[PDB]
Amino acid sequence: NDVFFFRNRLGFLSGENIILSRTAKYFNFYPASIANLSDDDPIDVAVST
Amino acid sequence: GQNAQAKMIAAQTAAGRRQAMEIMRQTNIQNADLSLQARSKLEEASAELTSQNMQKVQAIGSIR
């Protein structure tokens, strides 16, 4: 529905989901590696209410 | 008893030859154990270096 940039993360608003990109890599919406939860991982939080 | 002396000395050839063969068996077996220990050390080094890698993922991630 919308395209924005918050904290240097290219973000989208799809349905009830707010999707943010990596801190610097705007074109990488996937995490780095499943070994230890990283800091600049993408945020794909969903509003629950 | 020349035959008795020959038999006794033949036992010495037997004693030295089996003693030497055993020296090689013990020395060769110990070396294999040391090689296996070196391999285990390599595996431990790999594991600790992987731990160092995983810590790096989170560390450089925070910097970025």
From Swiss-Prot, chain A:
It is found in: Virion. It comes from the Viruses. Signal peptide: none annotated. Structural component of the short non-contractile tail. The tail complex is involved in viral genome delivery. Forms the end of the tail, including the canonical tube, the nozzle, and the small extensions below the fibers. Once the tail tubular structure is formed, the interface between gp11 and gp12 generates the proper environment to interact with the six gp17 trimers. Interacts with head-to-tail connector protein gp8, the tail component gp11, and the fiber protein gp17. This is Tail tubular protein gp12. The chain holds residues 349 to 397 of 794 of the full protein.
From Swiss-Prot, chain B:
It is found in: Virion; Host cell outer membrane. Keywords: Host cell outer membrane, Host membrane, Membrane, Viral genome ejection through host cell envelope, Viral penetration into host cytoplasm, Viral short tail ejection system, Virion, Virus entry into host cell. Its main location: virion. GO terms for cellular component: host cell plasma membrane; membrane; virion component. The keyword Cytoplasm does not apply. The keyword Membrane applies. It comes from the Viruses. Transmembrane segments: none annotated. GO terms for biological process: symbiont genome ejection through host cell envelope, short tail mechanism. Component of the cylindrical core that assembles on the inner surface of the capsid during capsid formation and plays a role in viral DNA ejection into the host cell. The inner core is composed of stacked rings of gp14, gp15 and gp16 proteins. Following binding to the host cell surface, the internal core is disassembled and gp14 is ejected along with gp15 and gp16 into the infected cell. May form a simple channel spanning the outer membrane. Interacts with the portal protein. Interacts with gp15. Belongs to the T7virus internal virion protein gp14 family. This is Internal virion protein gp14.
